[PDB]
Structure 1
Amino acid sequence: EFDAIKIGLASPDMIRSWSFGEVKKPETINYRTFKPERDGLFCARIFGPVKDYECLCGKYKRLKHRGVICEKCGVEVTQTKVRRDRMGHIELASPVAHIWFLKSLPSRIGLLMDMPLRDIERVLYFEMYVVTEPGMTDLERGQMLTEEEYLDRLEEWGDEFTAKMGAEAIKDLLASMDLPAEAEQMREELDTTNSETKRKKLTKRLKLVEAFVASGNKPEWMILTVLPVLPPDLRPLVPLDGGRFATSDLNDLYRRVINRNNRLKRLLELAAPDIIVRNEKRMLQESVDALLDNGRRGRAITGSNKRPLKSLADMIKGKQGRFRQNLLGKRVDYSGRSVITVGPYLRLHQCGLPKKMALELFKPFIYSKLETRGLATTIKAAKKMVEREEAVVWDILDEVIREHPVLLNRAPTLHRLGIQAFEPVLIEGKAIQLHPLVCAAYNADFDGDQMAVHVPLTLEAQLEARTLMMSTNNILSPASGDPIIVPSQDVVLGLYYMTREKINAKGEGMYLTGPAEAEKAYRTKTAELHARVKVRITETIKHENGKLTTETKMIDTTVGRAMLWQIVPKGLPYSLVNQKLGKKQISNLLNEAYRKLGLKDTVIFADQIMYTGFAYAALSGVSVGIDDMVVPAAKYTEIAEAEEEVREIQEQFQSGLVTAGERYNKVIDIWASTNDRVAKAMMENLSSEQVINRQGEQEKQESFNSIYMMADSGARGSAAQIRQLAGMRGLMARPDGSIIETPITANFKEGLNVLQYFISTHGARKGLADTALKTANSGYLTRRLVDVAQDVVVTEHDCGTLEGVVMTPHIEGGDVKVALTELALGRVVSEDILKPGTDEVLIPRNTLLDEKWCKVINDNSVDQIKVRSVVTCDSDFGCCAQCYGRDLARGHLVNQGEAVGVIAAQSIGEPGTQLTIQAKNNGSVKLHELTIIDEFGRTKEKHKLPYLSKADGDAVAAGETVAGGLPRVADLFEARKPKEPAILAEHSGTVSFGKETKGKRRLIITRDSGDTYEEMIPKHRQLNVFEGERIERGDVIADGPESPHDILRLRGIHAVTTYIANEVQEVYRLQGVKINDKHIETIVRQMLRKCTITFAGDSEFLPGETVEYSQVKIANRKLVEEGKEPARFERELLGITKASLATESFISAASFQETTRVLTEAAVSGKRDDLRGLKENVIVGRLIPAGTGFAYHQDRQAKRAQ
């Protein structure tokens, strides 16, 4: 129907054209008949009939008289909904300035007439005159005259000049401007100017003038002469229960405007003193600005209930505004909500749905089927049968829900796994039964959590639920590629208990034909779960090439291990089961099954694993008791020793040998050591036991303590919690941050006393409040990332670029932080991977590095590779498939139409709550910094070189001595400037000292061309450069934190990409969160979207103008095709907020935040929105140009092409 949305100024003729009448009175409704008045705010002649196909006087009261305007009353006989569309207008007695175009800094009016805002308000508030027409007089346009001066110069000259006061004067000045002449004047002066500040001033003014002349708008339209009036049903006056009436504040604001307008019209007939008329004009202006935007001008007007009246800008903007409350999110039908219980009998694709909920949600479907198969003649028959709850209704409900998927959601929806599709199973009850293996994706625990259920209606939605959102498809985490359905808690505990090994268990040394006879022996009480036996195992291996090799052997195992092997699918080695199975082991089992067998086998295996784990955890009988918390006897003696030594050091302090700070520090150290030793003793006592073996001696065995089994299996608990239960609680922190000297020498078994509990509360409160605030901080970060990266969709297959990024293993000392296999798994090769020391092509270009090629690279010892990345792609909009590579959630190449930006934003934002020289290897030494490389050719140590045992190329043996998380990420993504940044060498050249000017110092550099560049350095700066040294570009002059803007300007795109990726991944890896770097690179690509033109060239670009980089690239390609001088640009790093607010679409920018500024700028510039991204199509209800809708939009892009 429509392809674009245009925005611009509203002329008085246009506002009159929108209107169906003029509102003349502040009347709303009658106090007896409750009918609208003529010429009021609810007039039926202006806005439409109150009743469908009726008129106020009631003469024409049927559809026979449709479209006939009644002569007695004037009401058109039509539908009532026209009262939601028809507008009105008010003809203002005096012109009024628009508040948005005046007080939204920078002032468009003030910028246009080149006068300060205070001057314009002084004219508007009726304090000073302004000359409109100077005439044949020394006076100039726009110069102020006070009342006295106006009188003297009126006596001096008379009618030669014209001076006015108020909004009328501003209107005449705006209408008298000759925009092209002013534009030429600014162009010439800019051609002959030197100051940079005046350059910026005239650049903005010229941009505004050019925008006005191009958009077709007229400046005088910023002063309103006719005011539009909103349709009544959007500001309703409705009867409430009990006879009370409810109204919108817009009614009060409009009534004030109309009253003051009528009073002004009356005062201009009963000719009145100029002071009174001036005051009334002031009233009219204040009322109009209050109606448009309350609180911007000054004191916000309040109602009879003493809170500010809500204006139109408040309707439009904010968290409660129409964009975010009703357009980007909605309440939906066919939805329900209930508490969630656990269904251990369910399959991965099934969810338990209560019968009453299904009856309510699927009611139209039930009606349809009852009408179709004939038990209901009409729709009220079906409704009555459903209400009476007959049996056949239940069979019909079963048949409708037979294979109709439903969508389950849990708030907060941190990532796309928070909504998934399941096949419903009707259950008796009122609670939704949820499969345990999906809880980790939902972050759902059964302590009162509630879930929402949605019913997809159309066939397309059903097939999207079955194919995309179904639980069996989403088993890999899109953030990292790891399985997200890994078992936890009782499943892990059962698989651990069944796979443990006991000495001298019943049935030891027995020979079993296979897993079946192990099961038979366990069920017949011949052998225990933990008996060491020999079992015949038939094992089939599926190789990388697909070879299936089957072979049988006798293996020394445990009965439980064979019984578990019974459910392991064919194609997997038996070594994966022949061990005690913790959480890591089960995760490895599932990951290997997915890597070597596929998806269906993986889901069946996961279901069987969870069933078996539950069964054998129930059979184990694991329980917690007070005797399971064994307190080591060494704790009391260690506490006594620490206390005695603390007495000794107190004595030393009393002698003056040591100071107070030293005493504090070493007391902290001794208590920390005591805590560590008590924890070690408790672990050693808890983790072992002595048993009698078959031959009769004593043997050491791993303990079967319930708490130890709980901690070691990885089900619940870690060493810290057992330390708190059976060891020592340790040092705790005072609320300011300081650490109290005396620790809590008690655990939770003997219990704390009053003061120990008080110190515990000190930190407990801090933790809870920190979580409460950090949740909101992370949510706001995730929002910001989503709006910056929302437009990134895979739009192509190959972009045909040769650029790429260089990837090497991460080294932050003497050990590798992460191998290159992890960094390269799933990325496409950009430059051919030659074997080191050879010219053979091991890996061709445009190849996806899967597991097998990763193993090849690991075997051939490759250090540095080149791969395509999102930042280096050349696609005009979005990215291509090769530059992104594998999509982690699916395991194959990324498909066309995937919203990679939203995935990246969700992946980064989800873990936000969890957020807060001696050589050690043998090899050679290389100097660049210091690098120690193994004999295989891999760089394994990277060390700094401050301004050495071995020189360059000298071999070094082992041991030789050559000689705050979330705020950081948020600050990094907005590209903040550090408080004290590093001073960096602007240009490559020879350093030289300069005149130490008072206040702060200056330095100079001589370039290769002999030009001298001056630098402004503060006094307190430990300069590193020395005179006579040729420092390269990118060198550090003053040490300190590095600003990403400087890195981009002086080093390049790759440098800033690497910097951002490394720091954010340092923060994430500190807390043990694994996120792939392609998401971060998508965000960084969205940071690099604007360029400032330095050389204007011949293209329609002004110097120093920040424009979009893709537009410049397209223009430069066109100009190169035309053989004309292309533009020279510098690229800018923009923060996620500033990049989001500077999008080409003003709909997305207005829906993000700062709605007033975006709307004002777009209206002045006459912007046009093409609805190219996701948010715009979400607002207008269209299909998003991503995923299933992608093709659709492409078709339109063909139709507009033809």
Structure 2
Amino acid sequence: EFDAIKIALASPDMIRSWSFGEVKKPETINYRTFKPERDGLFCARIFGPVKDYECLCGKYKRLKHRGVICEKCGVEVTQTKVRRERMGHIELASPTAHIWFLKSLPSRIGLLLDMPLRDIERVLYFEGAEAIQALLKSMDLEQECEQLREELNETNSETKRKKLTKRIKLLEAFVQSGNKPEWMILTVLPVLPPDLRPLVPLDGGRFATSDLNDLYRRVINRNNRLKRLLDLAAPDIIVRNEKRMLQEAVDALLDNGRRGRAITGSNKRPLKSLADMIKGKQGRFRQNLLGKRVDYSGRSVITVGPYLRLHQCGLPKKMALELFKPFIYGKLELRGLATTIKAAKKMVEREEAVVWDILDEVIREHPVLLNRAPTLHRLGIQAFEPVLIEGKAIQLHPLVCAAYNADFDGDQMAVHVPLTLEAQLEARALMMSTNNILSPANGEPIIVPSQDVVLGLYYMTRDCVNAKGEGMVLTGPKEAERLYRSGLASLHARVKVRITEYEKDANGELVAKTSLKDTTVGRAILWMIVPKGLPYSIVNQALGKKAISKMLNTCYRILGLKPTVIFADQIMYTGFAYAARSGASVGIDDMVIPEKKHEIISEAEAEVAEIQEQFQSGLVTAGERYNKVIDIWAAANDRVSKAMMDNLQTETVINRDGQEEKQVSFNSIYMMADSGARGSAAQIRQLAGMRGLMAKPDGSIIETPITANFREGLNVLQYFISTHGARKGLADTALKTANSGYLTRRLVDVAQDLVVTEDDCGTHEGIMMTPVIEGGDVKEPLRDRVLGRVTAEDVLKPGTADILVPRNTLLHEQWCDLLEENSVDAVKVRSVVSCDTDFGVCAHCYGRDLARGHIINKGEAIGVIAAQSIGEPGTQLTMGGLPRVADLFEARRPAPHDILRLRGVHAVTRYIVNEVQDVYRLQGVKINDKHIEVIVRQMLRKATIVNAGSSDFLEGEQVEYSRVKIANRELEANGKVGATYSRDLLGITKASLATESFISAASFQETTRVLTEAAVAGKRDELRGLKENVIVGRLIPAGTGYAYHQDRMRRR
């Protein structure tokens, strides 16, 4: 029933129109009895009945006489809800100024006037503001603007022009807005409604009180003290001082603490004013409108369930019986088991057997949502089908843990229930766990087995020498299974088996081939779960973590989605089954210490001694033996580590048949490290080698290393030394989460409104792509950077008049292989930064969707995806570096500005992308360059005008790029001369605050100044972004709501 929100300055007549009651002289509610006293802050007459349909005197109590005010007492009969709707006013006796328009760095109550802030304050402080009021009343704006316009041309100094333009702009805006002068000084005061500032009873007789009711009473009494003094005609000496006491009192109800000496109450803490109820983490915007508390929700601890399918979860029945109450009530009413709501409620409370079948049928095909609190990317919320269990904990699928960052050492989780058909269908179609298998940040799978599954599959596919059953010839995998389960053969025996496999013939038709193959028993047993269409060579080896991931990706590429989930579940079942049968364990004798260690250290201790002799007689600099000793110790540590690994990797020696041979060993620690299940090489170094060299808290290297490992323990000194690094790591982890969170919030705020709105914009510009080569080693090839982009122009072959690549083609895996067969050159691209679309981007300038594989669809919120994709690895790194990227994205001056001014958008694009990827790649994090380009495009959305041309302009006139482009396009067909403009570059924090919408800018931060500018300019909000519709409670213009909004513009 509305389409826009309008903001402007208020007037005394409007304030009196808002009111229901006159000037409130009384101070107090009424402490003695419940009935409030009249004419005060709380009042039955002004704000309506205290109780529904009953007057204060009690003469009327019931409906049919409603709408008739009582005669004896004069009380209207209405529902009590009106007590949180109506307002009132206080009519003052002396005028007072408004602190917001005065207190600021660009003070705007004295910006129109030429008086400085100090002089204006001194006049206002009287060491009541009739001078200011009359000065603003008498001023004529039109003549001042006419004089200033002529004065601007005459001035030849750049410094003088800066202030003149600022004054002229403010004068013109104040004239065009419609707000009259002399309104920044108040003469009437509005009063907030009663039920939004209530008094809460306590266990004792006393009532808790709000800060606002104290400041209001203080203002009322200080203003009413002047009322009686006027009749008495007191000397002006007393009159002046009280006036100032009024000023500060008003400056208490408004923003407090902006002028020093903040008022306090019973305790030693400042009181919170009206300005404190709108800003900050505890204000309305960030605590009650962008987030809130909901119904139909629950919380519990999580445990692992190893028997579940990928689309299921385990839910306790005690929680479920209470989550789904209204559905149970409805179905109980349907079958006649109850005749009233109370009967159904009692029947559910005194639980019987009949209600459990009802609960079983209600949840048969109803999904639920599970969420873990930190919630870094969109995969932190998912949907599942619930299975009723016994107990109190929640059971979770082992394969979804890594995307949730969850482990079973005390984590908790929350659960929510959709209620409408649309919500259930959205949960099934968009958020189901079987839908999410590919990352949105890159093109890698998100489900991946680890730990016990990997170790089981690795052990299952290993190979030995002279094991039992070696040399047999088998009819197939079933014979291998039979022989192994009987006990006649080992899993590690080398045999010959007859295998049949299917392949794509020419059009997706499976064609079979049968042959004999040398393999092992375990590989043939595992072959029985592979889907039809894959080659046998993919399991005929030892299967590590990367091999299993490659298998899953190949199955997804060749055969699609439905076989992939079945394959994953079968792989998990097989891994869990075969890890238990091995009996893999860990013991103290698994950690083997090389025998030559006691030599390598000792000889090293000789060398360090020798240089000491060279220090007895002057032959080397005293600042040089440090480096030589450190190098000696590093070499010794390398020798010891190499000897340890050389002994550990081949520790098995085997008698084949009357002869000896070497083979890969079966030591538990070595297999755990090699398979990729748990444990890096450095940790094995620390366990069975040498602990190495430590560092001082400052950062220097302690000269003597730790020559012990964790098997043969440490002494007091080494253990004391090793605590500095641990404490420094823990402190670094504990204090740098907030930086990542703040950066993520800023990135989300700068790009929250970017949505795909078209298909092709028609532009022809773009970015040239070249491989990244620095120093001599190619850090980045010329293949992955152009995989999934769209060619801006035609690509020519390495010859005259030859076209190698068709235009507008979408490169996929087969196309990429065809290109790499004879790749000789590179391809240009179209970038979202160079897009002629107005208010959004077009699909072909974006590319493909990393989560799905095809072209991006209409209605995608790519800005939020980019922001999460960038912010997630920084936060996950916590629990150079982060300051470097925070300095780039804020456009900090050491320069990108000159890069843009000298080589176009390409210069800044390349600089920012390269300098961000350099930081992110050092930690081994993979993020596509699309998201950085999205953020950069958001970083440049303003233009500075120079030449007025035939269109309206104000010389400088920093304006929106899109609006200037639209004006130039409009003034082209008719025939005119356009304006001249230069492109600016802004930081994300500055770019967020300079937006056409003031609601979202106020939501971000710095509410007071944004609201001040909006009120003095008379701005209008059109509700076009995501945040505005979230705040008002409408469908967002993206996804399943997008078409809805497209209907709206079709209705006008």
1:1061 is aligned to 2:913: yes
Paired residues for 1:409-488 under 5 Å: 409-488=371-450
Aligned-pair CA distance for 1:718: 0.7
Map Cα deviations across residues 830-877 of structure 1 (whole Å, 9 max, x no partner): 222332225444432222211112112222214321122211111111
The residue type paired with residue 717 of structure 1 is G
C-alpha spacing 1:57/1:621, structure 2 compared with 1 (3 Å): same
Going from structure 1 to structure 2, the CA distance change for 1:1121 and 1:656 (only over 3 Å counts) comes to: farther
In the alignment, is the contact (CA less than 8 A) between 1:503 and 1:691 conserved in 2? no
> Which string of whole-angstrom CA distances, capped at 9 and with x for unpartnered residues, describes residues 29-82 of structure 1?
222212222111111222222211222222222223323333444432112222
Cα distance between partner residues in 1 of 2:238 and 2:576: 86
Point out the structure with the larger strand share: 1
SS in 2 for 1:228: strand
Alignment-derived partner of residue 1123 in structure 1? 975
1:82 aligns with 2:82: yes
Distance 2:622 2:577 in 1: 60
Alignment correspondent of 1:1153: 1005
Kindly provide the amino acid, as one letter, of the partner of residue 273 in structure 1.
Answer: P
Asked if 2 retains the 8 angstrom alpha-carbon contact of 1:339 and 1:450, the reply is yes
Contact 1:317–1:323 under 8 Å retained in 2: yes
Can you list the C-alpha shifts for 1:895-952, whole angstroms capped at 9, x where unaligned?
1111100000000000003547xxxxxxxxxxxxxxxxxxxxxxxxxxxxxxxxxxxx
User: Whole-Å Cα distance in 2 between the matches of residues 754 and 515 of structure 1?
Assistant: 58
2:901 corresponds in structure 1 to 1049
1:1177 partnered with 2:1020: no
1:608 to 570, 585, 599: 570
Q: Distance in 2 between matches of 1:538 and 1:1110?
A: 63
Amino acid at match of 2:754: V
2:6 corresponds in structure 1 to 6
**C-alpha distance in structure 2 between counterparts of 1:576 and 1:203, whole Å:** 73
2:866 aligned with 1:904: yes
Equivalent residue for 2:98? 98
Q: Which residue of 2 aligns with 1:747?
A: 709
Structure of greater relative contact order (alpha carbons < 8 Å, 6+ residues apart): 2
Q: What code does the residue aligned with 2:124 have?
A: L
Alignment-mate amino acid for residue 806 of structure 1: M
Shift of 1:823: 1.4
Letter in 2 for 1:1085: R
Among candidates 299, 315, 318, match of residue 280 of structure 2: 318
1:8-87 to 2 correspondences below 5 Å: 8-87=8-87
Provide the rounded CA distance (Å) in 2 between the counterparts of 1:121 and 1:229: 27
1:1102-1113 correspondence to structure 2 within 5 Å:
1102-1113=954-965
Does the CA contact (< 8 Å) of 1:318 and 1:324 recur in 2?
A: yes
| Contact 2:654–2:663, Cα closer than 8 Å, also in 1 | no
Q: Secondary structure at the match of 2:106?
A: coil
Aligned counterparts of 1:538 and 1:1054: Cα–Cα separation in 2: 55
Superimposed CA distance per residue, residues 1002-1023 of structure 1 (whole angstroms, 9 cap, x where no aligned partner): xxxxxxxxxxxxxxxxxxxxxx
Equivalences for 1:191-230 in 2 at 5 Å?
Answer: 191-230=153-192
2:882 alignment partner in structure 1:
966
The runs of 5 or more residues in structure 1 that have no matched partner are 128-165, 917-963, 979-1042
CA RMSD of aligned residues (A): 1.7
Q: Give the drift of 1:544.
A: 9.1
Letter in 2 for 1:508: E
| Cα displacement (A) at 1:372 | 1.5
CA–CA distance in 2 between the matches of 1:1070 and 1:545? 44
The 5-angstrom pairing of residues 356-755 of structure 1 reads 356-542=318-504, 546=508, 548-755=510-717
1:1145 shift after superposition: 0.7
- Measure the CA separation in 1 of the matches of 2:74 and 2:635: 93
Alignment of 1:184 onto 2:36: no
Alignment-derived partner of residue 267 in structure 1: 229
CA deviations on 1:419-456 (whole Å, 9 max, x unpaired) are 01111111111111111111111111111000110111
Q: What CA distance in whole angstroms lies between the structure 1 residues aligned with 2:198 and 2:672? A: 62
Report if the CA contact (8 A) 1:732-1:760 is conserved: yes
Which residue matches 2:114? 114
Find the residue that maps to 1:805 and give its secondary structure. Answer: coil
Q: TM-score, normalised by structure 2?
A: 0.98
The 8 Å contact of residues 480 and 1076 in structure 1, kept in 2 or not, is answered as yes
Which residue matches 1:171? 133
C-alpha distance in 2, partners of 1:431/1:26?
A: 58
| CA offsets 1:747-782 (integer angstroms, 9 cap, x no match) | 211222222222222111111111122211111111
Cα distance 1:726–1:285, how it changes in 2: closer, same or farther (>3 A)?
same
Question: What secondary structure is seen at the aligned counterpart in 2 of 1:205?
Answer: helix
Question: Does the 8 Å contact 1:23/1:41 carry over to 2?
Answer: no
Q: Which residue of 1 aligns with 2:787?
A: 825
1:1162 aligns with 2:1014: yes
Conserved 8 A contact 2:377-2:869: yes
Task: Give, in angstroms, the shift of residue 484 of structure 1.
Answer: 0.6
Q: C-alpha distance in 2, partners of 1:19/1:674?
A: 87
Q: What secondary structure sits across from 2:112 in the alignment? A: helix
Indicate how the Cα distance of structure 1 residues 863 and 547 shifts in structure 2: closer, same or farther if over 3 A, else same. Answer: farther
Query: Structure 2: which amino acid aligns with 1:973?
Result: F
Counterpart secondary structure, 2:32: coil
| Deviation sequence 1:1078-1126 (CA, Å, 0-9, x none) | 1111111101111111222232232222211111111111112332211
1:885 equivalent in structure 2: 847
Q: Is the 8 A contact 1:915 1:1068 kept in 2?
A: no
Tell me the secondary structure at the aligned position of residue 477 of structure 1.
Answer: coil
Say whether 1:1187 aligns with 2:1039: yes
Residue type at the aligned position of 1:3 = D
Distance in 1 (alpha carbons) for counterparts of 2:965 and 2:505: 48
TM-superposed CA distance for 1:545, in Å, is 5.8
Residues 695, 906 of structure 1: CA spacing in aligned structure 2 closer, same or farther, 3 A cutoff? same
Q: Matches of 1:1086 and 1:126 in 2, distance apart?
A: 49
Percent identity of the aligned residues?
Answer: 86
* Aligned-partner Cα distance in 2 for 1:74–1:1100: 59
SS of residue matched to 2:456:
helix
CA distance in 2, matches of 1:466, 1:907: 24
Shift of 1:92: 2.0
Taking the aligned partners of 1:849 and 1:1051, their CA distance within structure 2 comes to 29
Deviations 1:76-108, CA, capped at 9 Å, x for gaps: 211222222211111122222211111122111
Distance in 1 separating the partners of 2:631 and 2:234? 87
In structure 2, relative to structure 1, the CA distance for the partners of 1:840 and 1:427 (3 Å cut) is: farther
Match of 2:856 among 876, 894, 897: 894
TM (normalized to structure 1)?
Answer: 0.86
Letter in 1 for 2:912: I
Q: Alignment partner of 1:807: what SS?
A: coil
Secondary structure in 1 matching 2:330: helix
State the Cα distance separating 1:1162 from its structure 2 match: 1.0
Contact 2:594 2:644 in 1 (8 A): yes
What's the offset of the Cα at 1:25? Answer: 3.1
Partner Cα distance (1:487, 1:637) in 2: 43
What SS does the corresponding residue of 2:531 show, helix, strand or coil? coil
User: Take 2:604 and 2:26, find their aligned partners in 1: how far apart are those partners?
Assistant: 85
Local SS of the residue matching 1:5 = strand
Q: 1:520 to 1:1094 in 2, by over 3 A?
A: farther
Compared with structure 1, are the counterparts of its residues 1113 and 869 closer, same or farther at alpha carbon in structure 2 (3 Å cutoff)? Answer: same
Deviation per CA, 1:130-164, whole angstroms, max 9, x where unpaired? xxxxxxxxxxxxxxxxxxxxxxxxxxxxxxxxxxx
Contact 2:27 2:220 in 1 (8 A): no
In structure 2, relative to structure 1, the CA distance for the partners of 1:24 and 1:651 (3 Å cut) is: same
Give the Cα–Cα distance (whole angstroms) in 1 for the partners of residues 475 and 242 of structure 2: 104
Contact 1:835 1:860 in 2 (8 A): no
The answer to whether the 8 Å contact 1:535/1:555 transfers is: yes
1:302 aligned to 259, 264, 275, which one?
Answer: 264
1:441–1:484 contact (8 Å) kept in structure 2: yes
* Contact 1:915–1:966 (8 Å) recurs in 2: no
User: Following the alignment from structure 1 to structure 2, what is the Cα–Cα distance between the partners of residues 629 and 39?
Assistant: 87
